[PDB]
Curated annotation (Swiss-Prot), chain A:
Interacts with NOP14 and MPP10. Interacts with snoRNA U3. Component of the ribosomal small subunit (SSU) processome composed of at least 40 protein subunits and snoRNA U3. The chain holds residues 369 to 512 of 552 of the full protein. Involved in nucleolar processing of pre-18S ribosomal RNA and ribosome assembly. Has a role in the nuclear export of 40S pre-ribosomal subunit to the cytoplasm. Its subcellular location and association with pre-40S subunit are unaffected by RPS19 disruptions, suggesting it acts before the ribosomal protein. This is Nucleolar complex protein 4. Belongs to the CBF/MAK21 family. It comes from Saccharomyces cerevisiae (strain ATCC 204508 / S288c) (Baker's yeast). It is found in: Nucleus, Nucleolus.
UniProtKB/Swiss-Prot annotation, chain B:
It comes from Saccharomyces cerevisiae (strain ATCC 204508 / S288c). Belongs to the NOP14 family. It is found in: Nucleus, Nucleolus. Involved in nucleolar processing of pre-18S ribosomal RNA. Has a role in the nuclear export of 40S pre-ribosomal subunit to the cytoplasm. This is Nucleolar complex protein 14.
UniProtKB/Swiss-Prot annotation, chain C:
GO terms for cellular component: 90S preribosome; cytoplasm; nuclear microtubule; nuclear periphery; nucleolus; nucleoplasm; nucleus; small-subunit processome. It comes from the Eukaryota. The record marks 58, 99, 102, 106 as: Interaction with substrate rRNA. Changing residue 207 to D: Almost complete loss of SAM binding. No effect on growth and ribosome biogenesis. Its EC number is 2.1.1.260. One of its GO terms (biological process) is endonucleolytic cleavage to generate mature 5'-end of SSU-rRNA from (SSU-rRNA, 5.8S rRNA, LSU-rRNA). Changing residue 58 to D: Loss of substrate rRNA binding. No effect on growth. Gene3D superfamilies: 3.40.1280.10. S-adenosyl-L-methionine-dependent pseudouridine N(1)-methyltransferase that methylates pseudouridine at position 1189 (Psi1189) in 18S rRNA. Involved the biosynthesis of the hypermodified N1-methyl-N3-(3-amino-3-carboxypropyl) pseudouridine (m1acp3-Psi) conserved in eukaryotic 18S rRNA. N1-methylation is independent on acp-modification at the N3-position of U1191. Also has an essential role in 40S ribosomal subunit biogenesis independent on its methyltransferase activity, facilitating the incorporation of ribosomal protein S19 (RPS19A/RPS19B) during the formation of pre-ribosomes. It is an enzyme of class 2 (transferase). One of its GO terms (molecular function) is identical protein binding. This is Ribosomal RNA small subunit methyltransferase NEP1.
UniProtKB/Swiss-Prot annotation, chain D:
Belongs to the class IV-like SAM-binding methyltransferase superfamily. RNA methyltransferase NEP1 family. It comes from Saccharomyces cerevisiae (strain ATCC 204508 / S288c). The record marks 55 as: Stabilizes Arg-88. Its EC number is 2.1.1.260. It catalyses: pseudouridine(1191) in yeast 18S rRNA + S-adenosyl-L-methionine = N(1)-methylpseudouridine(1191) in yeast 18S rRNA + S-adenosyl-L-homocysteine + H(+). Homodimer. Interacts with snoRNA U3. Interacts with NOP14 and MPP10. Component of the ribosomal small subunit (SSU) processome composed of at least 40 protein subunits and snoRNA U3. GO terms for biological process: endonucleolytic cleavage in 5'-ETS of tricistronic rRNA transcript (SSU-rRNA, 5.8S rRNA, LSU-rRNA); endonucleolytic cleavage in ITS1 to separate SSU-rRNA from 5.8S rRNA and LSU-rRNA from tricistronic rRNA transcript (SSU-rRNA, 5.8S rRNA, LSU-rRNA); endonucleolytic cleavage to generate mature 5'-end of SSU-rRNA from (SSU-rRNA, 5.8S rRNA, LSU-rRNA); maturation of SSU-rRNA; ribosomal small subunit biogenesis; rRNA base methylation; rRNA methylation; rRNA processing. SUPFAM superfamilies: alpha/beta knot. Changing residue 53 to A: Loss of substrate rRNA binding. This is Ribosomal RNA small subunit methyltransferase NEP1.
Amino acid sequence: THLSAHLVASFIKKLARLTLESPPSAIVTVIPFIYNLIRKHPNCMIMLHNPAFISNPFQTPDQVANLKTLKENYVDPFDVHESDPELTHALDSSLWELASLMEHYHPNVATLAKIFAQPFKKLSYNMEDFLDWNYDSLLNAESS
Amino acid sequence: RTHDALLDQVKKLDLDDHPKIVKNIIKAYQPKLKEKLGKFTAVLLRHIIFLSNQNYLKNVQSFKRTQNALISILKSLSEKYNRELSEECRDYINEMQARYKKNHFDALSNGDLVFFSIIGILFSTSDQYHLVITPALILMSQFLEQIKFNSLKRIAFGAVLVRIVSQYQRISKRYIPEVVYFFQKILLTFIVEPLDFENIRLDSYELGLPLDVDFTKKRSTIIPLHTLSTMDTEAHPVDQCVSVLLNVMESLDATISTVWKSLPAFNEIILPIQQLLSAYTSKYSDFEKPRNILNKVEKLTKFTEHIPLALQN
Amino acid sequence: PQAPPVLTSKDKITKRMIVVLAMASLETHKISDKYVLLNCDDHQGLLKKMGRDISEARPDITHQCLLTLLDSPINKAGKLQVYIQTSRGILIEVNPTVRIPRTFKRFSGLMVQLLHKLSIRSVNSEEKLLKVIKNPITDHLPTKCRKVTLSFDAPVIRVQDYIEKLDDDESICVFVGAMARGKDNFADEYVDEKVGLSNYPLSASVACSKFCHGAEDAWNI
Amino acid sequence: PVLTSKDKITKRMIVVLAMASLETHKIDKYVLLNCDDHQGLLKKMGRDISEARPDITHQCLLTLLDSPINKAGKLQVYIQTSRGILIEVNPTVRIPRTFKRFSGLMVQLLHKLSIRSVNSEEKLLKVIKNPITDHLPTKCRKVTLSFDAPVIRVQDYIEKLDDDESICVFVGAMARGKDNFADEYVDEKVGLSNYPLSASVACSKFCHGAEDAWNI
């Protein structure tokens, strides 16, 4: 219960970069696991969307002058080489890697990444259902 | 006509140069009498794989014109018989994956690569869930990551796979996360001889590459004739190492703008690959493909937005 | 995303719009073998005997406004309810959850079910939908309210500017004159000002949506 | 002055209702096809229950006419029918506000193919030939209100237009159905609200935003 935002967000982002080069059996463990922690800690919801960057119609044209220039000055503040987990600036960065993961070659893995466009309706996500899958069990259940 | 061996053994009585139209006359006469071709289309799928397995000393003017015609025989049988081919393509995945359970490489055949390329020409490529292709592509995924790349043959036995997999998603253009794991595990094996990357967990330190290829425009290109080459790549000249790499350079570079350019995380995907591509152009300084890849990258590091997402809206 | 909480007369704290149609012609007459809603068009000759003129009794403008209010997105986002002030004095509360039938003849049968049984319940039957409530309207409006009247003789204002100067808990209430011709004095004892919408003489239907589609831009919907 | 299909120079708005269920039956007299007034006639003919709604045509026309932008004379309305019938409407027309006198006004018009008032100076309702693009002004912009489209502000969309580009909007009038009816016609699809709208509202939500940008 104690951990910070910066402590949890470092593990969510580092496992998210790790999903880029991973077997799909290792994805159906991480997507539930990232889904649990953001539901546990909703302060780190800011990396799934920064709503300063959303575009309303009912915002001022002078802010359009601001919102154009503000997006241009973005840099990714995340530092992979930093090993102190609270010190890494994963909170100030998003995680595009899970958004890319919605486009996936397997459907059921592409299904679970599509949770993150839908709302956070439930919490108890039961990882032991989704934890142990294998290349054998992916093939054996697919014809089944 | 009834058994997979017996039609082949009847073809074995004839010569292989004339065995093609003998089955085609048998295919016409079985049509001249749906139930007979239920067995006969099953035998042709096994036998076309078997000709790739058997021998390939015959050249393209001696084998492939007889080989592509037998595929063209299936093309006239595919569109009427999708119930027949789905029963064999489901099982041959179940056969060859269970053979992969037996052996990590030994039950894997060089003719097995053709089985996926036949399907992608026959069956509906662009589909999300195809009852043949989606077991195949998730088997190809297993076939990518799990096998242990300790020889140049297995590199070429995997270099064909990207050329097959990208034809599945030339039109679907979906993402395949093991292929970037497949490319990174390839690129450092030729530069083993390092300190920048301990992350890749490569298979064997044995094969490398000296700074000794001339890499002309006349240098040998992709042209993968596996059942001429792969059985004897291990008897190794220096040219055949680089030419396999030079495919994987181009099977990367083509698929960047088709597939990798589309995804939003493209800025974070390719940054390990850039330093890998840096390690070629900083070392040899005379290759032109890495410098051309990196300038294609320097456009696409500037061209995209790379704005943080607002998925929860 | 979830459904925003459906307002009633019982909630009085939440900021919202209220569009009230005043002096509607919704009257009940018996024929003998059934009961029918009164129409100017369907039966001109019946009103001559009753003495009330044909040109007043128009229920069609009400159903014209009820499709205008309920299909608007501010009825999707949960920020208005609508009250009906009948010319006979009857006060009808309309739940935002109802879907009023878009044909006129079903609406004629819908009203004569209302004016006798006093409450219309859905076939989903979780709650009562169109309930006749006890006069006056100043009871069942929210507490911190602002009360206006659409008048053609009023000074013309802009909708988005007028709502933006409301406080963060004050609720606008728009008494709309649904009468085809009549004076803008049906609610002088209620409201605190009169506001205008256009220099052109308007319908009762557009003056709803002229207000509503300014309201949604003023509340960023 | 009164807008015509002949007049193509002045920048002006055009709203076209599309797929409006306006079909004629014969019983001897003719009768307009209602969803409510006759259900078994839909069943014996086989035509579906939910589509045959002529009421929405009556409702939006009272919204389009009584809007002040029509009283300012800045638009004219065309009717695209589920049968494909194209009806030019005079902006100075005066429509039966009761639906049952509006009921015969289809079968009056659809058999005569022309309507002129008693003052007889010019024709009021004029059945004309497809396409609608022949009668529109030459520099025109054509869109379709679709709920799945990106949502825009009405007033900002029209101020961006040139001084001589006619805005045309094709509003689907079906109770349900595909909104792909004008993809051979329009530039794009635009959205107005976050909520699914009635066409009566969708006319008014577009008109009352169009009234502001033209100072009416």
